[PDB]
Structure formats: C-alpha cells, structure tokens
C-alpha cells in the first residue's frame, strides 16, 4: 500500500511536471528517469506478488 | 527518502539536478541489487566449493577439541576448556610465523592444518604427564589420518590394535618355531585373523 501511494503521488508529480514544462534538457532527463522508475516499480510489484 | 525529498521540493525544475543525482544513485543501487540476484547461483556455488575445501580443517578442529575435553578420563589434571582451544585456533590462524608471506590459499590451508596440530599438541602436552604424550600424539595421528584423503580408513587394523587383540583364539595355539613363545604364539593367532595376515 506504501508502493501504491508512492505510485499515485509520483503520477501527480508527473502531471505537475507536464504542466510546468510549457529547461528542456531537465524535462527530458526527468521523463527518462520517471520511465525507468515506472518499470522498476512494475518489477517491484511483481516480486511483491 | 526520495519520496520525502520530492514532496519537499515539489518537483521544481530548478531542483532537477539534486533530484536526478538521487534518482541515478537509486538506479545504481537497484542495478547492484539486480546484479546480486542475477548472480546468486554462481556465488552460492563458489561459497559451496570454498566450504568443501575448508571442511576438513573444521572437522579436525572439532575432533581435536573434543579429544582435548575427553582427555579428563586419563587423569584428573587434564581439564581443558573451550576457551583454551579457541585460543589455540586463534593463535594458529593469526599469530602464525609460518604464514608471514604465504599467499597460495591451498598452501595457507595446509600450513594452518599442520601448525594447528603441532601447536595443539605442544600446548596440551606442556601440562600433561610424560607417559601420556605418546597417547595424545597417537590420537592426533588418528585424527589426521581420518582427515587426510587418498588413504584407507584402516578401521579393521586400528580396531584389532586397540580392542581386537583380546578375542577368543586360544584353541589350536601351536608352538610354531622355537623362537615363538606361548604368548607370542597366541598373539600370532590373533593377528592372523586379519585378512592381510592370513598367511602369517
């Protein structure tokens, strides 16, 4: 449930970053790190299952 | 920590460098953990091989200590504690003059085993009656023979040497030759019971 809360919170932060985007390099790096973060947590949820 | 830092900084684009440094550190940590998980079998097999290599030394240590403890049966003065054998083991492992420059792991293991036997014998026999030195040396020799590889257990030979000499074989004790006496003849009959001495 902590993991789910973190997922919801950082989805909110992704929405906030999307709103704030419109430095471009900062945004691109942030999106890349967020995607790696998303796949990592999908793996973590799978291993918790 | 990442979650609290993110909600404290609100994901500001100016705080992006600090966020990215933490994120890449976390990715590095996760990659290290993933590498550890992806290499569990190799590490476990390596640990198993090392443990199999070092098992005979541990068995020798246990046998040596329990012979030391049971040494109280011969004489009331042979009381030895676990701390004494632990001191012996730590002395041979760390304060070993023969291990000053040895680097080959198998060579260090062999030196450790040999010096363990030597130091244990010396420290035990320094406080043991002179008539019992040979007994302890024989016990350590038996322990080494059990621990060594490529040699027969000699279970029948040792059993005959210790307790097998007293078995009922008095019947048919021929005088043999004039050199043999009656007790020597009986000893020959008893020893000939072994398969390796059937033609004695």
Curated annotation (Swiss-Prot), chain A:
Subunit structure: Homodimer. The cytoplasmic dynein 1 complex consists of two catalytic heavy chains (HCs) and a number of non-catalytic subunits presented by intermediate chains (ICs), light intermediate chains (LICs) and light chains (LCs); the composition seems to vary in respect to the IC, LIC and LC composition. The heavy chain homodimer serves as a scaffold for the probable homodimeric assembly of the respective non-catalytic subunits. The ICs and LICs bind directly to the HC dimer and dynein LCs assemble on the IC dimer. Interacts with DYNC1LI1; DYNC1LI1 and DYNC1LI2 bind mutually exclusive to DYNC1H1.
Protein's organism: Homo sapiens
Name under which the protein is recorded: Cytoplasmic dynein 1 heavy chain 1
Disease implicated: Charcot-Marie-Tooth disease, axonal, type 2O: An axonal form of Charcot-Marie-Tooth disease, a disorder of the peripheral nervous system, characterized by progressive weakness and atrophy, initially of the peroneal muscles and later of the distal muscles of the arms. Charcot-Marie-Tooth disease is classified in two main groups on the basis of electrophysiologic properties and histopathology: primary peripheral demyelinating neuropathies (designated CMT1 when they are dominantly inherited) and primary peripheral axonal neuropathies (CMT2).
Signal peptide: none
Its job: Cytoplasmic dynein 1 acts as a motor for the intracellular retrograde motility of vesicles and organelles along microtubules. Dynein has ATPase activity; the force-producing power stroke is thought to occur on release of ADP. Plays a role in mitotic spindle assembly and metaphase plate congression.
Family indicated by similarity: Belongs to the dynein heavy chain family.
Domain remark from Swiss-Prot or TrEMBL: Dynein heavy chains probably consist of an N-terminal stem (which binds cargo and interacts with other dynein components), and the head or motor domain. The motor contains six tandemly-linked AAA domains in the head, which form a ring. A stalk-like structure (formed by two of the coiled coil domains) protrudes between AAA 4 and AAA 5 and terminates in a microtubule-binding site. A seventh domain may also contribute to this ring; it is not clear whether the N-terminus or the C-terminus forms this extra domain.
Modification type N6-acetyllysine: residues: 32
Cellular localisation: Cytoplasm, Cytoskeleton
Curated annotation (Swiss-Prot), chain B:
Biological role: Cytoplasmic dynein 1 acts as a motor for the intracellular retrograde motility of vesicles and organelles along microtubules. Dynein has ATPase activity; the force-producing power stroke is thought to occur on release of ADP. Plays a role in mitotic spindle assembly and metaphase plate congression.
Protein family: Belongs to the dynein heavy chain family.
Subunit organization: Homodimer. The cytoplasmic dynein 1 complex consists of two catalytic heavy chains (HCs) and a number of non-catalytic subunits presented by intermediate chains (ICs), light intermediate chains (LICs) and light chains (LCs); the composition seems to vary in respect to the IC, LIC and LC composition. The heavy chain homodimer serves as a scaffold for the probable homodimeric assembly of the respective non-catalytic subunits. The ICs and LICs bind directly to the HC dimer and dynein LCs assemble on the IC dimer. Interacts with DYNC1LI1; DYNC1LI1 and DYNC1LI2 bind mutually exclusive to DYNC1H1.
Residues of the full protein shown: 3748 to 3947 of 4646
Domain description: Dynein heavy chains probably consist of an N-terminal stem (which binds cargo and interacts with other dynein components), and the head or motor domain. The motor contains six tandemly-linked AAA domains in the head, which form a ring. A stalk-like structure (formed by two of the coiled coil domains) protrudes between AAA 4 and AAA 5 and terminates in a microtubule-binding site. A seventh domain may also contribute to this ring; it is not clear whether the N-terminus or the C-terminus forms this extra domain.
Disease (UniProt): Charcot-Marie-Tooth disease, axonal, type 2O: An axonal form of Charcot-Marie-Tooth disease, a disorder of the peripheral nervous system, characterized by progressive weakness and atrophy, initially of the peroneal muscles and later of the distal muscles of the arms. Charcot-Marie-Tooth disease is classified in two main groups on the basis of electrophysiologic properties and histopathology: primary peripheral demyelinating neuropathies (designated CMT1 when they are dominantly inherited) and primary peripheral axonal neuropathies (CMT2).
Subcellular location: Cytoplasm, Cytoskeleton
Protein name: Cytoplasmic dynein 1 heavy chain 1
Any coiled-coil regions, as ranges: 1-53
